[model samples]
Target: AGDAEAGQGKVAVCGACHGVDGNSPAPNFPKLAGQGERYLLKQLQDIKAGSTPGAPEGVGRKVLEMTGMLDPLSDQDLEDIAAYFSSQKGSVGYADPALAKQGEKLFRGGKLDQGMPACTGCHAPNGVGNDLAGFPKLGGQHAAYTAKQLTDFREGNRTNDGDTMIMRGVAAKLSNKDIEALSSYIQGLH
Candidate 1:
């Protein structure tokens, strides 16, 4: 099991982009605070294996930005990092009124006609996500980063959505406007 108290001391290097409290002010960097512990742990595992002691090629998710950074971390180190990040309070963004309105509709009600499933079915109405299921807490996430991930999943550039291909299938049907709206709607959630 992961321990938050031990994680507190192990997260020193994570303070640069993630902030000491896990509430990063930068829009490009994602806020890891209050995220699902399992999800966080899985992501850490993927990152560490994405690009190892060799090239930027592995059987896991790859983020050029996070390349080489997770190399020195051990299994327990990764777990502790996840615990530390998940223990803090997350931040929210102020969405544009028009964008949020459109986004809200899609977030709450999926375009069933287009076979799109409601985000709340998985992420929950409050965007807390399913920790047990390893779904990420989408609330207070960076809209820019979220949009990128969604787009990547759709294009098959990011195929780390698990064995069932949950996100990839959902994202393939989304347009730029849909992505923008959904991303905006979730970021402003408290």
Candidate 2:
């Protein structure tokens, strides 16, 4: 548990990019609103430690930009920030209707012929994700950000996935079209 009230003042720096309410105005930045607390904490920890294994050198511009932002903060501060963001309303973006069908299929049923598992298996049908597992809430995430992550996973530029290596395996089998469709669909998911 964290103190959301106390976390409020500490997030002044974050407001410039992530928005004061956790919904970023930029398409390149991820929305932190209504995110899983554990997931957010884990990411913050990883970023602070500079331990994103498998990420290509200098490829994660966001991480580089955040290099010293958290150096002065404490574990409790991170937890509080996560708690504050988790309590806010999440994103709700529009999807490309043309790609909805294909994206829906891949996200809910996957391509069995390609040995791909449905994203819903981990992310849940509504993209709420598994909080206990720290899987992250993907609903209404930015399409550009999602697409980039998929591409990074596939290209071996971002490899911070846990021991299962699930994202890497899943991304490897997906075509660029599939990535785009999925990302677009997820942006509109509730």
Candidate 3:
């Protein structure tokens, strides 16, 4: 229910952090370019509602930095913003070869003994995820940001992966080294 052309006008205020093209300059802020619209909308709604995400009786995965930033934005405004970000081009990144090598192995072939699942199962071989499933695009994302998210999920600090516990489940089996490797590899995936 969003028009990309109409969405453009709604993102200028959002551009302060997310960038006009949805490519944030800061490593802490995720680059929203080419992300799935549904996923973006879900996050926008979550932030607006400030409800617990995939958890019980707690503040949701709140981005404390943007507190009250979305209070005035309507559903349609959020949808339009999602449409805009989803249409932008994602940036490319480079990864350390040694780390990427190990990461590639894990990304393509999860640890069967540990019950970990291959990222490619949802994120695809190149890291552009299944748009319909709203898994999100991982290519060219910031390694620091990616690592933090995974670590948060593992520690139960970020439980926004929905009831399926998708990210939390996978991250639970990841060691710091594994997370480092995967984040670096994913950064350079594109």
lDDT tens digits, residue span 87-156, model 3: 9999988899989998998899988999999999999999998888888889899998999998999998
lDDT of 1 by residue, 1-190 (tens): 5888888888787789889988887788888999988999998888778856575553688877787888888889888888888889887777778899988898888888889898898999989999998888998799998888889989988877878899999998899999999888888886
Worst 10 residues of 3 by lDDT: 51-60
Candidate 3 residue spans exceeding 4 A from truth: 51-59
* Candidate that would win on TM-score: 1
Question: TM-scores across all candidates?
Answer: 0.94, 0.92, 0.92
Instruction: Please provide, for model 2 over 24-142, each residue's C-alpha lDDT reduced to its tens digit, 9 standing for 90 to 100.
Output: 99988989999999988888877776634344453323376676788788999999998999989986999888998899999998999998999998899999999998898998999
Per-residue lDDT, model 1, residue 83, is 89
Give me the runs in candidate 2 sitting further than 4 Å from their true place. 51-62
Clashes of each: 0, 0, 0
Off by over 4 Å in 1: 53-58
What TM-score does model 3 achieve against the real structure? 0.92
The model with the greatest lDDT is 2
Q: After superposition, how far is residue 138 of candidate 3 from its true place, in Å?
A: 0.8
